[PDB]
Design a protein around this ligand. Structure first.
Ligand code: 8DG
Ligand code: 8OG
Ligand code: MG
Length: 291
Protein backbone atom coordinates (compact mmCIF):
# COMPACT_ATOMS: atom_id res chain seq x y z
CA UNK A 1 0.00 0.00 0.00
CA UNK A 2 1.31 3.45 -0.97
CA UNK A 3 0.87 6.59 1.02
CA UNK A 4 1.06 9.40 -1.62
CA UNK A 5 2.63 12.74 -0.74
CA UNK A 6 4.24 15.70 -2.45
CA UNK A 7 6.49 18.53 -1.32
CA UNK A 8 9.00 21.00 -2.53
CA UNK A 9 12.32 22.75 -2.37
CA UNK A 10 10.85 26.19 -1.71
CA UNK A 11 13.27 28.97 -2.76
CA UNK A 12 13.69 32.69 -2.98
CA UNK A 13 16.46 35.18 -4.09
CA UNK A 14 18.97 35.86 -1.29
CA UNK A 15 22.97 28.31 -6.86
CA UNK A 16 22.87 31.56 -4.72
CA UNK A 17 19.17 31.46 -3.89
CA UNK A 18 18.06 30.42 -0.43
CA UNK A 19 15.94 27.38 0.33
CA UNK A 20 13.57 26.59 3.13
CA UNK A 21 14.31 23.88 5.65
CA UNK A 22 11.81 23.12 8.33
CA UNK A 23 11.94 21.62 11.81
CA UNK A 24 9.26 19.42 13.27
CA UNK A 25 9.08 18.99 17.06
CA UNK A 26 7.27 15.67 16.87
CA UNK A 27 10.28 13.98 15.21
CA UNK A 28 12.92 16.59 16.08
CA UNK A 29 13.80 16.53 12.34
CA UNK A 30 14.98 18.94 9.70
CA UNK A 31 13.51 18.24 6.32
CA UNK A 32 11.66 19.61 3.31
CA UNK A 33 8.04 20.80 3.41
CA UNK A 34 5.61 18.11 2.17
CA UNK A 35 2.49 16.21 2.98
CA UNK A 36 -0.07 13.63 2.02
CA UNK A 37 -2.49 14.08 -0.89
CA UNK A 38 -6.12 14.86 0.16
CA UNK A 39 -8.94 13.03 -1.48
CA UNK A 40 -9.04 13.98 -5.13
CA UNK A 41 -5.75 15.97 -4.97
CA UNK A 42 -3.05 15.76 -7.54
CA UNK A 43 0.61 15.84 -6.38
CA UNK A 44 1.28 19.39 -7.62
CA UNK A 45 -1.84 20.71 -5.89
CA UNK A 46 -0.91 18.90 -2.63
CA UNK A 47 2.66 20.22 -2.86
CA UNK A 48 1.45 23.82 -3.15
CA UNK A 49 -1.08 23.32 -0.27
CA UNK A 50 1.45 21.71 2.02
CA UNK A 51 4.09 24.37 1.35
CA UNK A 52 1.54 26.99 2.30
CA UNK A 53 0.30 25.12 5.35
CA UNK A 54 3.78 24.31 6.67
CA UNK A 55 5.73 27.49 5.69
CA UNK A 56 3.05 30.18 5.33
CA UNK A 57 4.23 30.83 1.77
CA UNK A 58 2.41 30.80 -1.48
CA UNK A 59 4.53 29.61 -4.44
CA UNK A 60 4.71 28.77 -8.10
CA UNK A 61 5.87 25.26 -8.91
CA UNK A 62 8.42 24.71 -11.65
CA UNK A 63 10.68 21.64 -12.44
CA UNK A 64 9.89 18.32 -10.82
CA UNK A 65 12.83 16.94 -8.81
CA UNK A 66 12.10 13.28 -8.58
CA UNK A 67 10.50 10.80 -6.30
CA UNK A 68 11.47 9.35 -2.96
CA UNK A 69 10.03 6.33 -1.16
CA UNK A 70 10.38 4.98 2.38
CA UNK A 71 8.80 2.36 4.67
CA UNK A 72 6.02 3.34 7.07
CA UNK A 73 3.50 1.37 9.20
CA UNK A 74 0.76 1.78 6.50
CA UNK A 75 3.27 0.44 3.89
CA UNK A 76 5.26 2.81 1.62
CA UNK A 77 5.52 6.60 1.74
CA UNK A 78 5.85 8.01 -1.80
CA UNK A 79 6.92 11.62 -2.18
CA UNK A 80 7.20 13.54 -5.37
CA UNK A 81 9.09 16.85 -5.11
CA UNK A 82 9.03 20.16 -7.07
CA UNK A 83 11.11 23.30 -7.26
CA UNK A 84 8.80 26.05 -5.97
CA UNK A 85 9.56 29.79 -6.15
CA UNK A 86 8.15 31.69 -3.12
CA UNK A 87 5.51 34.30 -3.96
CA UNK A 88 5.28 35.65 -0.44
CA UNK A 89 4.24 34.92 3.07
CA UNK A 90 5.49 34.55 6.60
CA UNK A 91 6.31 31.61 8.74
CA UNK A 92 4.86 31.41 12.26
CA UNK A 93 6.11 28.66 14.61
CA UNK A 94 3.56 26.13 15.71
CA UNK A 95 3.29 22.63 17.18
CA UNK A 96 3.66 21.01 13.72
CA UNK A 97 6.58 23.03 12.39
CA UNK A 98 8.46 25.24 14.90
CA UNK A 99 11.37 26.52 12.89
CA UNK A 100 11.95 27.46 9.34
CA UNK A 101 15.39 28.51 8.16
CA UNK A 102 16.35 30.02 4.82
CA UNK A 103 19.78 28.76 3.69
CA UNK A 104 21.99 28.71 0.68
CA UNK A 105 22.08 25.28 -0.95
CA UNK A 106 25.44 24.35 0.47
CA UNK A 107 24.35 25.01 4.09
CA UNK A 108 20.89 23.49 3.50
CA UNK A 109 22.65 20.29 2.41
CA UNK A 110 24.26 20.13 5.92
CA UNK A 111 21.01 21.00 7.70
CA UNK A 112 18.94 18.30 6.00
CA UNK A 113 19.20 15.05 7.88
CA UNK A 114 17.62 12.55 5.44
CA UNK A 115 19.81 11.28 2.58
CA UNK A 116 16.80 11.36 0.19
CA UNK A 117 16.10 15.04 0.93
CA UNK A 118 19.74 15.77 0.12
CA UNK A 119 19.36 13.73 -3.07
CA UNK A 120 16.37 15.94 -3.94
CA UNK A 121 18.40 19.07 -3.22
CA UNK A 122 21.23 17.80 -5.46
CA UNK A 123 18.65 17.54 -8.29
CA UNK A 124 17.51 21.01 -7.56
CA UNK A 125 20.95 22.50 -8.00
CA UNK A 126 21.76 20.48 -11.17
CA UNK A 127 19.72 22.82 -13.45
CA UNK A 128 18.33 26.31 -13.44
CA UNK A 129 15.32 27.00 -11.16
CA UNK A 130 14.17 30.42 -12.27
CA UNK A 131 12.12 28.86 -15.00
CA UNK A 132 9.20 29.73 -17.16
CA UNK A 133 6.69 26.95 -18.00
CA UNK A 134 4.79 25.55 -20.99
CA UNK A 135 1.95 23.12 -20.09
CA UNK A 136 1.04 20.72 -22.86
CA UNK A 137 -2.27 19.02 -22.14
CA UNK A 138 -3.94 16.12 -23.95
CA UNK A 139 -7.67 16.82 -23.99
CA UNK A 140 -9.90 14.93 -21.59
CA UNK A 141 -12.03 11.86 -22.33
CA UNK A 142 -14.48 12.41 -25.23
CA UNK A 143 -15.99 9.04 -26.01
CA UNK A 144 -14.79 6.97 -28.99
CA UNK A 145 -14.03 8.07 -32.56
CA UNK A 146 -16.79 7.60 -35.09
CA UNK A 147 -16.51 5.27 -38.09
CA UNK A 148 -16.02 8.32 -40.32
CA UNK A 149 -12.76 9.51 -41.92
CA UNK A 150 -11.06 12.28 -39.90
CA UNK A 151 -11.16 12.81 -36.15
CA UNK A 152 -14.71 14.20 -35.44
CA UNK A 153 -14.17 17.95 -35.22
CA UNK A 154 -17.14 18.58 -32.87
CA UNK A 155 -17.10 15.51 -30.65
CA UNK A 156 -17.27 16.95 -27.08
CA UNK A 157 -15.90 15.79 -23.74
CA UNK A 158 -17.88 13.09 -21.96
CA UNK A 159 -18.94 13.33 -18.32
CA UNK A 160 -15.61 12.04 -17.10
CA UNK A 161 -13.79 14.43 -19.42
CA UNK A 162 -15.75 17.38 -18.14
CA UNK A 163 -14.65 16.42 -14.64
CA UNK A 164 -11.00 16.22 -15.81
CA UNK A 165 -11.38 19.67 -17.27
CA UNK A 166 -12.63 21.03 -13.93
CA UNK A 167 -9.86 19.25 -11.98
CA UNK A 168 -7.17 20.56 -14.31
CA UNK A 169 -7.81 24.14 -13.17
CA UNK A 170 -6.06 23.59 -9.76
CA UNK A 171 -3.38 21.42 -11.50
CA UNK A 172 -2.45 24.06 -14.06
CA UNK A 173 -2.73 27.00 -11.60
CA UNK A 174 -0.13 25.29 -9.45
CA UNK A 175 2.41 26.12 -12.17
CA UNK A 176 1.23 29.71 -12.63
CA UNK A 177 -0.58 29.18 -15.99
CA UNK A 178 -1.43 32.61 -17.53
CA UNK A 179 -2.21 32.09 -21.29
CA UNK A 180 -4.40 29.57 -23.12
CA UNK A 181 -4.13 27.84 -26.44
CA UNK A 182 -6.08 24.91 -27.93
CA UNK A 183 -6.00 22.94 -31.14
CA UNK A 184 -8.96 23.61 -33.46
CA UNK A 185 -11.17 20.84 -32.08
CA UNK A 186 -14.10 21.18 -29.67
CA UNK A 187 -12.80 18.65 -27.18
CA UNK A 188 -9.49 20.59 -26.80
CA UNK A 189 -11.21 23.89 -26.12
CA UNK A 190 -13.59 22.33 -23.65
CA UNK A 191 -10.74 20.83 -21.61
CA UNK A 192 -9.31 24.30 -20.88
CA UNK A 193 -12.63 26.22 -20.71
CA UNK A 194 -12.90 25.91 -16.97
CA UNK A 195 -9.39 27.36 -16.65
CA UNK A 196 -10.31 30.14 -19.12
CA UNK A 197 -13.29 31.05 -16.85
CA UNK A 198 -10.96 31.03 -13.86
CA UNK A 199 -8.41 33.36 -15.46
CA UNK A 200 -11.01 35.35 -17.37
CA UNK A 201 -8.86 34.71 -20.44
CA UNK A 202 -9.69 33.84 -23.95
CA UNK A 203 -8.38 30.59 -25.54
CA UNK A 204 -6.22 31.16 -28.69
CA UNK A 205 -7.24 28.71 -31.47
CA UNK A 206 -4.41 26.66 -33.07
CA UNK A 207 -5.29 25.04 -36.42
CA UNK A 208 -1.61 24.10 -36.89
CA UNK A 209 -1.75 21.77 -33.84
CA UNK A 210 -4.53 19.34 -34.82
CA UNK A 211 -3.68 15.74 -35.66
CA UNK A 212 -4.54 16.42 -39.32
CA UNK A 213 -2.26 19.50 -39.57
CA UNK A 214 0.55 17.86 -37.62
CA UNK A 215 0.46 14.85 -40.00
CA UNK A 216 0.44 17.15 -43.02
CA UNK A 217 2.96 19.69 -41.78
CA UNK A 218 4.85 18.66 -38.71
CA UNK A 219 7.48 21.37 -39.21
CA UNK A 220 4.85 24.12 -39.02
CA UNK A 221 3.52 22.60 -35.78
CA UNK A 222 7.04 22.58 -34.30
CA UNK A 223 7.70 26.16 -35.28
CA UNK A 224 4.36 27.23 -33.83
CA UNK A 225 5.01 25.48 -30.49
CA UNK A 226 8.30 27.39 -30.10
CA UNK A 227 6.57 30.60 -31.12
CA UNK A 228 3.93 30.13 -28.40
CA UNK A 229 6.69 29.23 -25.91
CA UNK A 230 8.65 32.42 -26.64
CA UNK A 231 5.79 34.75 -25.69
CA UNK A 232 5.71 36.19 -22.20
CA UNK A 233 3.70 34.25 -19.64
CA UNK A 234 3.18 30.55 -18.99
CA UNK A 235 1.09 29.04 -21.75
CA UNK A 236 -1.21 26.14 -21.67
CA UNK A 237 -1.50 24.28 -24.96
CA UNK A 238 -4.21 21.66 -25.28
CA UNK A 239 -3.97 19.23 -28.13
CA UNK A 240 -4.37 15.60 -29.32
CA UNK A 241 -2.81 12.17 -28.86
CA UNK A 242 -0.98 11.89 -32.18
CA UNK A 243 0.53 15.33 -31.81
CA UNK A 244 1.97 15.48 -28.26
CA UNK A 245 4.37 12.52 -28.12
CA UNK A 246 6.14 13.66 -31.29
CA UNK A 247 6.44 17.26 -30.19
CA UNK A 248 7.69 16.31 -26.75
CA UNK A 249 10.24 13.78 -28.07
CA UNK A 250 11.48 16.32 -30.62
CA UNK A 251 11.99 18.99 -27.99
CA UNK A 252 13.60 16.66 -25.43
CA UNK A 253 16.09 15.39 -28.05
CA UNK A 254 17.07 18.90 -29.25
CA UNK A 255 17.64 19.93 -25.64
CA UNK A 256 19.12 16.67 -24.36
CA UNK A 257 16.42 16.50 -21.70
CA UNK A 258 15.46 13.17 -20.25
CA UNK A 259 11.91 12.80 -19.01
CA UNK A 260 11.69 10.88 -15.79
CA UNK A 261 8.14 9.65 -16.57
CA UNK A 262 6.35 9.15 -19.87
CA UNK A 263 2.78 8.75 -20.97
CA UNK A 264 0.10 10.17 -23.20
CA UNK A 265 -3.25 9.72 -21.37
CA UNK A 266 -6.31 11.88 -22.04
CA UNK A 267 -6.18 14.65 -19.49
CA UNK A 268 -2.47 14.33 -18.83
CA UNK A 269 -0.08 17.24 -18.68
CA UNK A 270 3.55 17.75 -19.73
CA UNK A 271 5.30 20.44 -17.71
CA UNK A 272 8.07 21.88 -19.89
CA UNK A 273 10.46 24.09 -17.94
CA UNK A 274 12.47 26.66 -19.88
CA UNK A 275 15.46 28.74 -18.82
CA UNK A 276 16.60 31.51 -21.25
CA UNK A 277 14.51 29.84 -23.94
CA UNK A 278 16.17 26.43 -23.46
CA UNK A 279 14.27 23.35 -22.22
CA UNK A 280 15.58 22.11 -18.88
CA UNK A 281 12.80 19.74 -17.72
CA UNK A 282 9.94 17.69 -19.23
CA UNK A 283 7.65 16.33 -16.53
CA UNK A 284 4.70 14.06 -17.44
CA UNK A 285 1.80 14.27 -15.02
CA UNK A 286 -0.99 11.69 -14.92
CA UNK A 287 -4.52 12.78 -15.65
CA UNK A 288 -6.01 14.23 -12.43
CA UNK A 289 -8.39 11.31 -11.86
CA UNK A 290 -5.65 8.68 -12.37
CA UNK A 291 -3.40 7.89 -9.38
N1 8DG B 1 10.19 14.17 6.04
C1 8DG B 1 10.82 12.99 5.92
N2 8DG B 1 10.63 12.04 6.89
C2 8DG B 1 11.25 10.84 6.80
C3 8DG B 1 12.11 10.60 5.64
N3 8DG B 1 12.62 9.37 5.78
C4 8DG B 1 12.10 8.92 6.91
O1 8DG B 1 12.33 7.75 7.37
N4 8DG B 1 11.31 9.72 7.56
C5 8DG B 1 10.67 9.34 8.83
C6 8DG B 1 10.48 10.47 9.81
C7 8DG B 1 9.26 10.01 10.61
O2 8DG B 1 9.72 9.26 11.74
C8 8DG B 1 8.49 9.09 9.67
C9 8DG B 1 7.12 9.61 9.24
O3 8DG B 1 7.12 11.01 8.93
P1 8DG B 1 6.43 11.59 7.56
O4 8DG B 1 7.07 13.00 7.48
O5 8DG B 1 6.91 10.66 6.52
O6 8DG B 1 4.87 11.41 7.98
P2 8DG B 1 3.86 12.45 8.62
O7 8DG B 1 2.53 11.86 8.17
O8 8DG B 1 4.10 12.75 10.10
O9 8DG B 1 4.27 13.77 7.80
P3 8DG B 1 3.68 14.11 6.32
O10 8DG B 1 3.90 12.92 5.47
O11 8DG B 1 2.26 14.42 6.59
O12 8DG B 1 4.36 15.44 6.10
O13 8DG B 1 9.35 8.87 8.55
C10 8DG B 1 12.22 11.68 4.61
O14 8DG B 1 12.90 11.55 3.57
N5 8DG B 1 11.58 12.82 4.83
N1 8OG C 1 17.68 18.55 15.62
C1 8OG C 1 18.11 17.37 15.13
N2 8OG C 1 19.15 17.41 14.28
C2 8OG C 1 19.65 16.28 13.74
C3 8OG C 1 19.04 14.96 14.08
N3 8OG C 1 19.73 14.02 13.41
C4 8OG C 1 20.67 14.72 12.72
O1 8OG C 1 21.52 14.12 11.95
N4 8OG C 1 20.66 16.05 12.89
C5 8OG C 1 21.54 17.13 12.36
C6 8OG C 1 20.83 18.45 12.05
C7 8OG C 1 21.30 19.45 13.12
O2 8OG C 1 22.07 20.54 12.59
C8 8OG C 1 22.14 18.65 14.12
C9 8OG C 1 21.38 18.43 15.45
O3 8OG C 1 22.01 19.11 16.54
P1 8OG C 1 21.25 20.26 17.38
O4 8OG C 1 20.01 19.62 17.97
O5 8OG C 1 22.23 20.74 18.42
O6 8OG C 1 21.01 21.33 16.33
O7 8OG C 1 22.44 17.42 13.45
C10 8OG C 1 17.89 15.00 15.03
O8 8OG C 1 17.29 13.95 15.38
N5 8OG C 1 17.50 16.21 15.49
MG1 MG D 1 4.23 17.30 6.41
Amino acid sequence: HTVRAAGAVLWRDAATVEVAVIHRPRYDDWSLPKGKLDQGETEPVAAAREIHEETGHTAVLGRRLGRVTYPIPQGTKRVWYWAAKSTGGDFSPNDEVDKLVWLPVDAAMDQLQYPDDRKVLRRFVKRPVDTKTVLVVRHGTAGRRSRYKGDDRKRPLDKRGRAQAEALVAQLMAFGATTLYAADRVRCHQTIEPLAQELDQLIHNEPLLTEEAYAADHKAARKRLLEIAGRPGNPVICTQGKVIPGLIEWWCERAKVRPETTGNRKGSTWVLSLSDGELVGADYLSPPDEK
